[PDB]
Design a protein around this ligand. Structure first.
Ligand SMILES: [Zn+2]
Ligand SMILES: [Zn+2]
Ligand SMILES: [Zn+2]
Length: 572
């Protein structure tokens, strides 16, 4: 009942009862909250409510102190002091932005902008509030009960009436009933169970509503600059492979935390693992939000670091299949590879946080709370995709608002920038360099002369709200017959439903732009599907076309992005 004020640290007996997180507010700040918002309930050891039997006055602005007790205007004794006077609420030890965070529904971009331009303690309040709001929104959706089981990978579902149906993509993981986590794709629906359980008719699913723990650590620890490499011991014997990154590796040792913006295929994994070889005695924890991001860092480590000093941490509630070639759950190994949500409470000489565009401020805080480290390295690209904000429906979230790290990279610049793309044919490098990298990304590879664009709006049908463009898939089919080298191509679109249709008609392996991030393929076929803010997002467009090592075919709906593609145009 006694804590610190989230705005000015001042100790208090006062929490806001109307805030979902019930933050401690000091007398001076608690007033400015209750007098400017619909939030009027104030909590202490006992709540600020009229003590008179059967009186329902809970508004702190309508209440007074009668001796040591609280009463309304109708019940207060003659000698009574109002709880609201001289810019204070009466409590022991006697904000515009705090009010907006406390009362917003998180459906507006401007909400996320504020949660990322506010003070550091308000970034934690914002991140707790948001995640709590995100979790209580999961309860809004209807239950799905299994009507009939067709096979081992298909069934028919019955949905609760009066409650909306959640989007049936990979982003929405149900808990089966505790028969393990499950997902669905498009009345023939495809069921993907984490544990292979003989799907029972009548068994119901509910979305994994997890409890939001409070945040203590900042998103970013305060910056410290050093005169010399601190707490790390370099080599002189450093293989030429990693010689490019020696000056950056020294920068990492001469600051508390550093930011690396690595555009696609510019050597992020190579840099992350090359850091271990430069500080060979240093204990490094490798963390990212996703299992795929952590498994990509494991693959690079397997090639360059000794396998007996590497441990892949896997949560006891094992959700999806992940990296197998390390010792599992040895927290004490010199090299630890673990997702943010599974991180143990430990210390490190260096923490490397990868795929930083996908981190929320909640993720940034949890890392600082579980890992005490000499150096923090933040690797990713603010020109790539952020974490989905399930509540945000109005306005577009710009890269400078993704999280504190991206904000720094978009304002003061990143500490280090990998400027040469080794993956993509020059046609793709030149396109994205101009689009999102202010012409600072350079091509290693020559033009492939295998990068094609076709402007073809087709016809847009919708599986609920997920978009399909059968004519765009039809154009791809015609192209494949005349270009049999593309038989090996990965099909990519901004929509699962387009992918589902392209899977049946083309038989190509299929990937959403969002799930393609961090991966690379020889050939890519991209159908934009629609002209929407989703399918025209320059970050998503950037990720889409930079997956390709050799060739890409882009069937485009948007004139702007079509004209910018520096590709050979095709006819039909
Ligand atoms: Zn305060
Ligand atoms: Zn409040
Ligand atoms: Zn009363």
């Amino acid at each position: 009942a006694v804590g610190a004020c989230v705005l000015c640290n001042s100790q208090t007996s006062l929490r806001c009862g109307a805030c979902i997180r019930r933050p401690f507010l000091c007398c001076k700040c608690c007033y400015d909250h209750v007098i400017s918002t619909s939030h009027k309930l104030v909590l202490s050891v006992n709540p600020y409510v009229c003590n008179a039997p059967g009186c329902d006055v809970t508004d702190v602005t309508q209440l007074y102190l009668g001796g040591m007790s609280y009463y309304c205007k109708s019940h207060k004794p003659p000698i009574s002091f109002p709880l609201c006077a001289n810019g204070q609420v009466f409590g022991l030890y006697k904000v515009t932005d705090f009010n907006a965070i406390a009362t917003c529904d998180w459906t507006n971009a401007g909400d996320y902008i504020l949660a990322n331009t506010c003070t550091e303690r308000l970034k934690l309040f914002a991140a707790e509030t948001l995640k709590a709001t995100e979790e209580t929104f999961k309860l809004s959706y209807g239950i799905a009960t299994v009507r009939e089981v067709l096979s081992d990978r298909e069934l028919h579902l019955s949905w609760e009436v009066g409650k909306p149906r959640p989007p049936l993509n990979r982003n929405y993981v149900f808990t089966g009933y505790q028969i393990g986590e499950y997902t669905f794709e498009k009345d023939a629906v495809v069921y993907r169970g984490t544990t292979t359980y003989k799907l029972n008719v009548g068994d119901y699913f509910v979305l994994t509503s997890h409890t939001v723990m409070p945040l203590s650590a900042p998103t970013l620890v305060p910056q410290e600059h050093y005169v010399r490499i601190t707490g790390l011991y370099p080599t002189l014997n450093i293989s030429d492979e990693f010689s490019s990154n020696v000056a950056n590796y020294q920068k990492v040792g001469m600051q508390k935390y550093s930011t690396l913006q690595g555009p696609p295929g510019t050597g992020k994994s190579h840099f992350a693992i090359g850091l271990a070889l430069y500080y060979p005695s240093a204990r490094i924890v490798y963390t990212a939000c996703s299992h795929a991001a952590v498994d990509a860092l494991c693959e690079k480590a397997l090639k360059y670091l000794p396998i007996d000093k590497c441990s892949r941490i896997i949560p006891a509630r094992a959700r999806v299949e992940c990296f197998d070639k390390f010792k599992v759950n040895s927290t004490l190994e010199q090299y630890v590879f673990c997702t943010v949500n599974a991180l143990p409470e430990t210390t490190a000489d260096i923490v490397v946080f990868d795929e930083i565009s996908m981190a929320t401020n909640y993720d940034l805080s949890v890392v600082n709370a579980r890992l005490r480290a000499k150096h923090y390295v933040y690797i990713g690209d603010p020109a790539q995709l952020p974490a989905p904000r399930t509540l945000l429906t109005k306005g577009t979230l710009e890269p400078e608002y993704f999280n504190s790290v991206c904000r720094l990279m978009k304002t003061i610049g990143p500490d280090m920038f990998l400027g040469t793309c080794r993956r993509c044919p020059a046609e793709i490098v030149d396109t994205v360099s101009a689009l999102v990298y202010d012409n600072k990304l350079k091509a290693h590879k020559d033009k492939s002369a295998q990068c094609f664009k076709m402007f073809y709006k087709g016809v847009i049908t919708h599986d609920v709200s997920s978009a399909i463009n059968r004519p765009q898939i039809g154009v791809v089919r015609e192209f494949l017959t005349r270009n049999p080298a593309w038989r090996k191509a990965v099909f990519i679109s901004p929509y699962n439903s387009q992918n589902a249709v392209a899977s049946k008609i083309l038989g190509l392996p299929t990937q959403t732009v969002d799930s393609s991030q961090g991966s690379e393929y020889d050939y890519v076929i991209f159908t934009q599907t629609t002209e929407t803010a989703h399918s025209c997002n320059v970050n998503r467009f950037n990720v889409a076309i930079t997956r390709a090592k050799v060739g890409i075919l882009c069937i485009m709906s948007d004139r702007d992005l079509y004209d910018k593609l520096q590709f050979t145009s095709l006819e039909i």
